[PDB]
C-alpha cells in the first residue's frame, strides 16, 4: 500500500508541475491532464457560487476563451504542497497578465491564488482556484466597496 | 532527520487541531499557541492588503475585539492537510457566526476559508486566513458589484 501511495504522489506532483507551467498555446491541450469527467474552475466569485467547468469538452472550450481573455497569463511564485493524501495537492502562487473581458477596458490583472488538485488514476479529477475577487474587480475598473473601519481597533 | 521531522509534524498537527476547535472564552488564550513574535490575520480584504496582527500581546488584544465582533464564531467542516514541510499545514473549512461590526446592522456571516499555519519550535509563527470577501460584504449589507457575464461563454 505504501509503495502505491508513494508512486501516486510522485506522478501526481509531475502533473501539478506541468499544469502550473502550461502557458501560451499549450493551454489548448491542458484538458488532457484531466479525467474525462474532470472538473476545473474558480471557486471565489462575486456571486458566491463557483464557476465550475465540467468534462473535457467544456474544459477544452474554456481554454479557447482563456487564450483570448487572459492571453499572456502566467503563474509565478509557485509553491506546491503534497499532503497526506497522495491524490490531493495544494498550490500557493501568484498570477498575472492582461485581462481582456468582453465589455470592459483592457486591463492588467494580478492576484494571489490557492489551487486545490484532486487526482484519480493519474489525472486531475477536480481543480479549484481561490483568490480575492476584489483584485479582479480592480483590474476591470469596477469599484470595490470599503468596509468602514473607524470603530475597529487599529 | 526523519525522527525530528515526524515528531514535529505530529506535535504541530495537535496545535492546528486545537486552534481550529477553539471557541467561546477559550479564544482569549489562543495567542498562547503562537511564538512571541507570531503573526496571524486575514489575507483577503477589500483593500487588497492583509490585516496582520503581529506579536503575542497584540494577538491577545485582537481576541478581545474578536469576541465582540464575532461573538459566537465556529469553524466547521475542518480538513487538515499536512505537507512535506513538517512545519507547514493547510486547512480547508467553513466558518459561521454573528457579525457585529461597529456601525453596521448585526448580521449572520458564513464563508468558506483556507488557513495556512507555519510553525517554529512547537508554536505558530504565521497564521493566515483566505476567504472571499464578497460573502462578508453580504453579511454586512454592503452591495457586491457584479461582473457582467453576457460576453462570456455560458
Ligand atoms: O475570471 C473568471 C474565471 C476565471 C477562471 C475560471 O476557471 C479557471 C480554472 N480553469 C477552468 C477550465 C480550465 C482549467 C481550470 C473561471 C472563471 C470569471 C468569469 C467567467 C469567465 C469565463 C467564462 O466562460 C465564464 C465565467 S465570471 C467571473 C465573475 C467574477 O466575479 C470573477 C471572475 C469571473
Ligand atoms: O473581518 C475582519 C478581520 C477578521 C479577522 C482578522 O484576523 C484573523 C486572525 N486573527 C489573529 C490570529 C488569531 C485569530 C484572529 C482580521 C480582520 C476585517 C476587519 C477588521 C476586524 C477587526 C479589527 O480590529 C480590525 C479590522 S476590517 C475588514 C475589511 C474587509 O474587507 C474584510 C474583513 C475585515
Residue numbers in the entry:
A (entry chain A), B (entry chain B): 12 to 165
Text of the article:
The C-terminus of one monomer functions as a lid, shielding the binding site of the neighboring monomer and thereby contributing to substrate binding and stabilization of the complex. The active site of BcPhzB features the same amino acids as the target enzymes from P. aeruginosa (overall sequence identity: 58–59%, sequence alignment: Figure S1) but crystallizes more readily than the P. aeruginosa proteins.
Based on a computational drug repurposing study, Ho Sui et al. proposed the FDA-approved selective estrogen receptor modulator (SERM) raloxifene (RAL, 6) as a potential PhzB inhibitor. RAL binds in a different part of the active site compared to the previously reported binding mode of the substrate analogue (1R)-3-oxocyclohexanecarboxylic acid and induces a shift of the C-terminus of the second monomer, which acts as a lid to the active site. This shift enlarges the binding pocket to generate space for the bulkier RAL molecule. This pushes the C-terminus of the second monomer upward and provides additional stabilization. As predicted in silico by Ho Sui et al.,8 we confirmed binding of RAL to the pyocyanin biosynthesis enzyme PhzB by nDSF and cocrystallization.
